[PDB]
Amino acid sequence: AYTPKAEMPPEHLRKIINTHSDMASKMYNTDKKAFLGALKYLPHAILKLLENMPHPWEQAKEVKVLYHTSGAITFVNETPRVIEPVYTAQWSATWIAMRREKRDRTHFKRMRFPPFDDDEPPLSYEQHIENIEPLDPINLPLDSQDDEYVKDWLYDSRPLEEDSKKVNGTSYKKWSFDLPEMSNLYRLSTPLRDEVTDKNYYYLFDKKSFFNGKALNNAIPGGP
């Protein structure tokens, strides 16, 4: 048998969760035991939620969830995947945006912590946050021409989803690139992945010398 799981309307979840807000009725006696029983899994839901955070070039991520029909808990069911060089380029590229915007404006205000007062109940998404159009993310100007290869798909959530040649597929594993694109990414990532390229430089610094220094109880000048 085995038909796959049925995606649903988010409206359904929303109604569940804001229904269970107020419960004083007797009908909730078995939905409260589900809340307590669910407390055991909460530290995992925090995990999956917090490893899927947006990243700055994203305005919003839409992620699958897996919810308990009594609205007892909501797990984020994706796992993030990234092309390593593409990801490095994105982080390096924002990096340069951060320095340019740090040197740019004179007064840089920082958010007050916590942002919301203790007594204000956490505001709902569908009312407050949903209607507003989002503010722009960090991106970077990125150049008119040089970057023509990457510039189209660079800042996308999952940079290449539909390309038959460039990537496995929607499942998004096993990337494959052409040469000049890689030339562009290696060009962008210089503020981060810039490093030494000779085995010879490392010399005493390589693991084996650290394992020795630990075993013999010595120290290299800069070693731990």
Partner 1 sequence: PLPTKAEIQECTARTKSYIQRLVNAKLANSNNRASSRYVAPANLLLNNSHHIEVVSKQMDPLLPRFVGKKARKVVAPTENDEVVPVLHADPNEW
Partner 2 sequence: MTSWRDKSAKVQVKESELPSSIPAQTGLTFNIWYNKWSQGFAGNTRFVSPFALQPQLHSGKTRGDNDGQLFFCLFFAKGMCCLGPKCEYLHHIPDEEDIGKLALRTEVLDCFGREKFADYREDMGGIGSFRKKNKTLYVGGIDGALNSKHLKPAQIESRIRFVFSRLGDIDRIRYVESKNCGFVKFKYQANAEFAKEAMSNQTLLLPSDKEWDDRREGTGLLVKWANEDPDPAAQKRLQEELKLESLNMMVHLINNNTNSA
Partner 3 sequence: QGHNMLNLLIHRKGLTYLHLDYNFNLKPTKTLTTKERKKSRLGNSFHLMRELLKMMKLIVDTHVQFRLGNVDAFQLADGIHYILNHIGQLTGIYRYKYKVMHQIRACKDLKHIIYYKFNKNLGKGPGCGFWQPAWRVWLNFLRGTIPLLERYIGNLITRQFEGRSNEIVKTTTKQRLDAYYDLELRNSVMDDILEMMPESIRQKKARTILQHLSEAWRCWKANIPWDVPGMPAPIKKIIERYIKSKADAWVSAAHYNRERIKRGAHVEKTMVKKNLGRL
Partner RNA sequence: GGAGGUCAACAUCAAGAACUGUGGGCCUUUGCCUAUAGAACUUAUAACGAACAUGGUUCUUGCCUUUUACCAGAAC
Partner RNA sequence: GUUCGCGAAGUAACCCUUCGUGGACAUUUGGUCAAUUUGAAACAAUACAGAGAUGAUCAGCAGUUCCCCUGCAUAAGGAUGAACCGUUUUACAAAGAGAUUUA
Partner RNA sequence: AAUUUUUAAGGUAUGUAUUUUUUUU
Contact residues toward partner 3 (CB under 8 A) are: 17, 20, 32-33, 35-47, 49-51, 53-54, 56, 60, 71-74, 91, 94-95, 98-99, 101-103, 108-111, 113-116, 118-123, 128-129, 132, 134-138
Q: Which of 169, 137, 173, 179 is nearest to 156 (CA)?
A: 137
Closer residue to RNA, CB minimum distance, 33 or 128: 33
Closer residue to partner 2, CB minimum distance, 22 or 104: 22
Is the Cβ–Cβ distance between 186 and 194 less than 8 Å?
no
Q: How many angstroms separate the CA atoms of 41 and 48, rounded?
A: 11
Closer residue to partner 2, CB minimum distance, 5 or 26: 26
**Which of partner 2, partner 1, partner 3, none sits in contact with 25, Cβ below 5 to 8 A by type?**
partner 2
Q: How many angstroms separate the CA atoms of 135 and 66, rounded?
A: 28
Enumerate residues 14-43 that contact partner 2 by CB under 8 A: 23-26, 32
Q: Does 30 bind partner 1 (CB under 8 A)?
A: yes
Q: How many angstroms separate the CA atoms of 148 and 187, rounded?
A: 13
Alpha carbon separation from 117 to 111, 113, 120 (Å, rounded): 14, 9, 6
Q: Provide, rounded to whole angstroms, the least separation between the CB of residue 169 and RNA.
A: 3
The two beta strands, 65-67 and 74-76, are antiparallel
Q: How many residues bind partner 2 (CB under 8 A)?
A: 5
Considering only the C-alpha atoms of the chain, give the largest distance between any 2 of them, rounded to a whole number of Å. 74
On the 0-12 / 13-18 / 19+ scale of CB atoms within 10 A, 154 is buried
**Which of partner 2, partner 3, partner 1, none sits in contact with 136, Cβ below 5 to 8 A by type?**
partner 3
Enumerate residues 82-141 that contact RNA by CB under 7 A: none
Is the Cβ–Cβ distance between 74 and 125 less than 8 Å?
no
> Which residues on neighbouring strands pair with residue 75, listed in sequence order?
66
Is the Cβ–Cβ distance between 92 and 193 less than 8 Å?
yes
Q: Provide, rounded to whole angstroms, the least separation between the CB of residue 151 and partner 3.
A: 19
Which residue among 13, 16, 17, 34 contacts partner 1 (CB under 8 A)?
Answer: 34
Closer residue to RNA, CB minimum distance, 12 or 214: 214
**Binding-site ranges for RNA (CB under 7 A):** 2, 4-5, 25-27, 29-30, 64, 77-81, 158, 164, 168-172, 199, 206-208, 214
**Binding-site ranges for partner 1 (CB under 8 A):** 30, 33-34, 37-38, 68, 70, 72-73
**Binding-site ranges for partner 2 (CB under 8 A):** 23-26, 32
